Ligand binder design. Structure first.
Ligand SMILES: Cc1nc2cc3nc(N)[nH]c(=O)c3cc2[nH]1
Ligand SMILES: Cc1nc2cc3nc(N)[nH]c(=O)c3cc2[nH]1
Ligand SMILES: [Zn+2]
Ligand SMILES: [Zn+2]
Lengths: 361, 361
């Protein structure tokens, strides 16, 4: 396989479906990435993550640098070996997680991150898709502060590029994505886009969203923001999101996604279904022999009832967290597959309308 | 298969190896039963429990009556269906877990257990091996109190027998075990044995042990206690125990075992190895690429390092509990297989000596 190759196989409006080829495997787009911030997708074995259909998982520079240590993981053979996932891994750079200066950020032991240190940690982890070190701009932000923050992030983007490129092994076997900032402001988003494209990356993330602005506002920004990015490279919406966020985002040109919701909300009792989420702890499920969802093909829905999973979660049993998470990740992957197939078949717009009609009914 | 058939295939001294045939499957003896007190073997899917080699698991009347409810589980199709384990299940009767009288015991909602109610709950759960409702005598016990308690338990034994037999479906498809009491006193143990044999059961448990008396004292009581039981029926030592307890107990004639140690101690960081237990949280394991145990054939030892599992447990990750438990249950099942094979081959005494020499070195 090449280091990195993104190919678009079919389009409908702004939506795209295709593949990213990397040395460690292929990634079908639009893609959902399960989050595994401490070198584990919570409550799942990697083989289970894979069985659900995930092509790639996300790791986090910040968390792994604190525990178990980036150098430690390198010494042990890298993150893939350590956690037993041999397919691509994307690592966030820490920019979402202090003493701040133009040089970087110190967290308090006390810990330092910068473009250089972030990129190095990602190299020590052995990540396949490396994210530029940025500042995710808090929301709401005044235009001045959004601009200052965006500007610093673009300088940090160039520093991330150069650090990555200065490491032969990394530059030859991994990919590097830039992150667009600019808050909700079109001109800032354009300036950031231009800056990133001038540097040049393998992929472009839309950063700074999902941090309190609401879906209508998020979609609005995506409306003008994604067309600013190079069309021929993947578009990644960081940390998004609920099933309906994902559908709308793909409608606006997004190709990649990650979110803690399927895992986190699973362990707390929320199960995604095609009729909308349910909280399995609700007394109405105590004697419901139906599976979590009526159509889901996952192993959990093949074998156990709502009633059982209800008992498990109420009892605080670990099996409840395992089953809830396997289902929700599988659900998310089935959503992604339905999106890919519908775009490939030229009926994605219909799919999204039908989806919304049922999910919200 | 028959309702119940125990056959002994080979003996060495007091040790026996053979099989219990039941409608839901065969149980190889000497047997270790993983404990699953809230309708789950903690942190394992039933298919995983089975993959480790377990033939049967234990459930608990007391816990299941409180949560989720015995009647509820019957309404939902029984415990096998509910939790997805289709092989035999043994249920303890509640006698180890108040207002006490000759009639039974009230716990505080407020909850009542008696021979009749206990047996009925076990029927509602659909258990395959039903345990008589008893009183586990606290240790230490004076001879008078041990006798009074033992005597009450024998009366309760007859009541358990009659309740079981009064339920056609139960009597035809499940088995019933009596429990010997008598604390540490030979004459009381003999009297209890005689009483149980006079009633007649499919199996005989040694109760009242592992409740603080120490291995030397436990073995001493087993020395005279197990020969008192009918030789041609299984001998079950309730709640025992560590690997070395199990070896010594088989040397004294015990055929069946259950204990929370492999699961509980797993989630707390203790891993069983042929060189003795280790606590994986210990800093000395932080960069140890070796599997938990050097010979273990389990999937965990095939795929992950001590270092990784160390990280998981220290991080409080659910995967750490899952992997620790799978290994420890598999370890326990490999121990049972080595015991069965060595008795079958007439070299069990050598096996136990070699075992002790390494486990304690
Ligand atoms: C929900 C959400 N998660 C996010 C993660 C992010 N990471 C980076 N590096 N940069 C970001 O801007 C960023 C934004 C996010 N929003
Ligand atoms: C460690 C241990 N677990 C036990 C469970 C028991 N259950 C019953 N019914 N009766 C018992 O005597 C009994 C004794 C036990 N010892
Ligand atoms: Zn499902
Ligand atoms: Zn193992």
């Amino acid at each position: 396989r090449p280091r990195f190759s993104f190919s678009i196989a079919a389009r409908e409006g702004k939506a795209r479906t295709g593949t990213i080829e990397m040395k460690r495997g292929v990634i079908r787009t639009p893609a959902f990435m399960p989050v595994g911030t401490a070198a584990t997708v919570k409550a799942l074995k990697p083989e289970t993550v894979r069985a659900t259909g995930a092509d790639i998982i996300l790791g986090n520079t910040y968390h792994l640098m604190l525990r178990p240590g980036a150098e430690r993981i390198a010494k042990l053979g890298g993150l893939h070996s350590f956690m037993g996932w041999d397919r691509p891994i994307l690592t966030d750079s820490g920019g979402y997680q202090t003493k701040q200066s133009e040089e970087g950020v110190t967290f308090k032991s006390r810990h330092m991150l910068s473009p250089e240190r972030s990129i190095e940690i990602q190299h020590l982890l052995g990540s396949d898709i490396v994210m530029a070190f940025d500042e995710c701009t808090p929301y709401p932000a005044t235009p001045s502060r959004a601009a200052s923050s965006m500007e610093r992030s673009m300088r940090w983007a160039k520093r991330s590029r150069d650090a990555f490129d200065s490491r032969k092994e990394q530059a030859e076997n991994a990919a590097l994505f830039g992150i667009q900032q600019g808050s909700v402001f079109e001109n800032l988003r354009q300036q950031s886009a231009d800056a990133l494209a001038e540097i040049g990356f393998d992929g472009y993330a839309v950063g700074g969203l999902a941090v309190g602005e609401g879906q209508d506002e998020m979609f609005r920004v995506l409306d003008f923001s994604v067309p600013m990015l190079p069309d021929d490279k993947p578009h990644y919406l960081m940390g998004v999101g609920k099933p309906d966020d994902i559908v709308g985002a793909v409608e606006r040109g997004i190709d990649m996604f990650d979110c803690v919701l399927p895992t986190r909300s699973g362990r707390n009792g929320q199960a995604f279904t095609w009729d909308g989420p349910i909280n399995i702890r609700n007394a109405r499920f105590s004697e419901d022999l139906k599976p979590l969802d009526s159509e889901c093909h996952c192993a959990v829905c093949q074998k156990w009832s709502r009633a059982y999973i209800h008992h498990l979660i109420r009892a605080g049993e670990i099996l409840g967290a395992m089953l809830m998470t396997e289902h929700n990740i599988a659900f998310y992957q089935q959503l992604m597959q339905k999106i890919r197939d519908s775009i490939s078949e030229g009926r994605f717009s219909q799919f999204a309308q039908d989806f919304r009609a049922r999910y919200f009914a």
